[PDB]
């Protein structure tokens, strides 16, 4: 959620994702903790005994048939964490995540109700306004002439400025603004 | 392949800014700067009961068929207090085993 | 009422607790700045299992790409802090 995906997943990444998903579905099948630990050790043993192959085509065929087996006998109703996609209370507090620019539209009476907070907010707005030009200059100076450009962003390179495009993720709403 | 120092340093600086912003989200101590047993049962039951009973007695019984009840289930062996019409009981009840 | 808030020290202590109960590593050698493969001697399956244990400890799911980015208990703690908005 915090790192943008690359162009493709490597074979190691696909194997690790399958391993994690298989362990989660195994837990969902064998609910009980000791039984889950037993079968998770068995699954780890299977991955270890197919670990070292030195043949990319054989490894890819093993991965393909392992994904086939996973889709054949996955749990139809797996365990999903709350605050995770597909689970309960996933997008529950999005109705309370107010996007923080409405404080500009707040009345002077309401701003007078919280004076110190709005002084600090004005200081933050001044910092953003002063940092934006150096952010744009650093992004233009980033060596991306043509071709391969990823979704990653650079940090603050010189002393005294801020990472580019910092505002939308520094001033994001809290995960439970209640 | 964990964090390259590029995004590691970016995450560290963004983390420092996020900690400062969340710390600034705290409220000052002065903020926000603002500018008996049975009384509820008397106020919210008795007065509405008075109004409702006025509407029932003097605006429904004054109308013909606004309140209609069924028969009060007369049984054999009681007195009707309207005309003196006590009704006779049933017959000899031949079965009396249970 | 319910749900006491969690701080950086509590997050660090719980992460260190789980890693000390891994039983594969750390014979009084673990620190907060110990890399899982560089100076703890693990591999990718072990790191995936460590992430699974952290998820089961804290009751929420770390997404796969961020999870495979995480390689040290310090940055596990930093990830929990960034997700939960700690030090308000």
């Amino acid at each position: 959620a915090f790192c943008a995906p690359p162009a493709y997943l490597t074979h190691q990444q696909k194997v690790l994702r399958l391993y994690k998903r298989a362990l989660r579905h195994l837990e969902s099948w064998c609910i009980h903790r000791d039984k889950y630990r037993y079968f998770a050790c068995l699954m780890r043993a299977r991955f270890e005994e197919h670990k070292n192959e030195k043949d990319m085509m054989r490894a890819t065929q093993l991965l393909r048939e392992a994904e086939e087996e996973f889709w054949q006998n996955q749990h139809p109703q797996p365990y999903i964490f709350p605050d995770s996609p597909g689970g309960t209370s996933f997008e529950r507090y999005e109705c309370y995540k107010v996007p923080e620019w409405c404080l500009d539209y707040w009345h002077p009476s309401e701003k007078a109700m919280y004076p110190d907070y709005f002084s600090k907010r004005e200081q933050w707005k001044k910092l953003r306004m002063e940092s934006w030009d150096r952010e744009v200059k650093q992004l233009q100076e980033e060596t991306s002439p043509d071709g391969i450009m990823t979704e990653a962003l650079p940090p603050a390179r010189r002393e005294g400025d801020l990472p580019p495009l910092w505002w939308h993720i520094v001033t994001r709403p809290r995960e439970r603004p209640t | 392949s964990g964090y390259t120092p590029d995004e590691k340093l970016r995450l560290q600086q963004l983390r420092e800014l996020r900690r400062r912003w969340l710390k600034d989200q705290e409220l000052s101590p002065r903020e926000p700067v603002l500018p008996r047993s049975s009384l509820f049962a008397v106020s919210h039951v008795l007065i509405p009961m008075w109004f409702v009973h006025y509407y029932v007695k003097y605006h429904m019984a004054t109308k013909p068929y606004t309140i209609v009840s069924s028969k009060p289930r007369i049984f054999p062996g009681d007195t009707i207090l309207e005309t003196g019409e006590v009704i006779p009981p049933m017959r000899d009840f031949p079965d009396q085993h249970h | 009422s319910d749900a006491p808030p969690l701080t950086l020290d509590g997050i660090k202590d719980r992460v260190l607790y789980v890693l000390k109960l891994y039983d594969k590593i750390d014979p009084e050698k673990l620190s907060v700045n110990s890399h899982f493969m560089k100076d703890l001697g693990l591999d990718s399956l072990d790191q995936v299992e460590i992430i699974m244990a952290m998820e089961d400890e804290f009751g929420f799911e770390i997404p796969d790409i961020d999870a495979e980015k995480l390689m040290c208990p310090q940055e596990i703690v930093d990830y929990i802090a960034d997700k939960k908005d700690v030090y308000e």
């Binding site: 309370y96 923080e100 409405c102 539209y105 009476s109 309401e110 907070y117 709403p173 603004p177 | 705290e26 | -």
Partner: peptide
């Protein structure tokens, strides 16, 4: 303590 400023829209109008 630890009271946090909840962000709300302008309900004044």
């Amino acid at each position: 303590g630890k009271r946090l400023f909840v962000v709300k829209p302008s309900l004044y109008y």
